[PDB]
Amino acid sequence: GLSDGEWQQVLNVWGKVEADIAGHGQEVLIRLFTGHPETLEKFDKFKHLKTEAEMKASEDLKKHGTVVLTALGGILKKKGHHEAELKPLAQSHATKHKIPIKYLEFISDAIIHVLHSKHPGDFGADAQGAMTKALELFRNDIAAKYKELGFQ
Ligand code: HEM
C-alpha cells in the first residue's frame, strides 16, 4: 500500500534504471550472484560463471538482466495493480524455477544496493523508502501465491 507520492518517487527512480536498463540489470544480477552464490545454482545457463569477471563479460547475463528488469518495470508501472502481470511470474518461479521467497528478498536488497552504487548521493532517503516499500509489495504478493501453491 503505497501513496501516490511514493509511487511518484518509485517511477522517478525507475527513470534512472530505464536510461540504462542493461547496465542496471547486469549489476543487480551480479550483486545477487556474488552476494548469495546459492542463487547462481538456480540458473542452468549461468552456473558456469565461476568468476565475477565472467559475469561482467557475459552478454547473456546482461540480456537476462534486461528481461528481469523489464518485467519488474512493467509491474512497477502498474502502481500495485499488477495481478495479471505478477501471477504468471509467481507461477513460473514457484512451479518451474522453484525460487524460494528468500531469493526475492535477496534481489530486492540488491536493487537497493545497486541504485546507491550507481547514483551515490542521488538516491535520497525518501526515494529509498518508496522503492523499498514497492519491492516489499511485489514480494508479499508473490508470497501469497507461493502459499496458495504450497511452495517453499
Ligand atoms: C525482481 C524479481 C524477478 C523478476 C521480475 C523476474 C522475472 C523473470 C522473467 C520475466 C523470466 C522469464 C519468464 C519466466 O520464466 O517466467 C524469468 C526467468 C527466470 N528467473 Fe526470474 N525474476 C526475478 C527474480 C528471480 C530470482 C531472484 C531468481 C533466482 C535466484 C530467478 C530465477 C529465474 C530463473 C532460473 C529463470 C529461467 C531462466 C532461463 O533459463 O531463461 N528470478 N524471471
Swiss-Prot record:
UniProt-listed CDD domains: Mb
Residue ranges of every copy of the Globin domain listed in the record: 1-147
Amino-acid positions noted as binding heme b in the UniProt annotation, renumbered to this chain: 93
Keywords carried by this UniProt record: Cytoplasm, Heme, Iron, Metal-binding, Muscle protein, Oxidoreductase, Oxygen transport, Phosphoprotein, Transport
Top-level EC class as recorded in UniProt: oxidoreductase
Entry EC number(s): 1.7.-.-, 1.11.1.-
GO cellular component: sarcoplasm
Catalytic activity as recorded in UniProt: Fe(III)-heme b-[protein] + nitric oxide + H2O = Fe(II)-heme b-[protein] + nitrite + 2 H(+); H2O2 + AH2 = A + 2 H2O
Superkingdom field: Eukaryota
GO molecular function: heme binding; metal ion binding; nitrite reductase activity; oxygen binding; oxygen carrier activity; peroxidase activity
Main location: cytoplasm
GO biological process assignments: oxygen transport; removal of superoxide radicals
Modified residues (Phosphoserine): 3
Family per record: Belongs to the globin family.
Subunit structure: Monomeric.
Function: Monomeric heme protein which primary function is to store oxygen and facilitate its diffusion within muscle tissues. Reversibly binds oxygen through a pentacoordinated heme iron and enables its timely and efficient release as needed during periods of heightened demand. Depending on the oxidative conditions of tissues and cells, and in addition to its ability to bind oxygen, it also has a nitrite reductase activity whereby it regulates the production of bioactive nitric oxide.
Entry protein name: Myoglobin
Species classification: Eukaryota, Metazoa, Chordata, Craniata, Vertebrata
Gene: MB
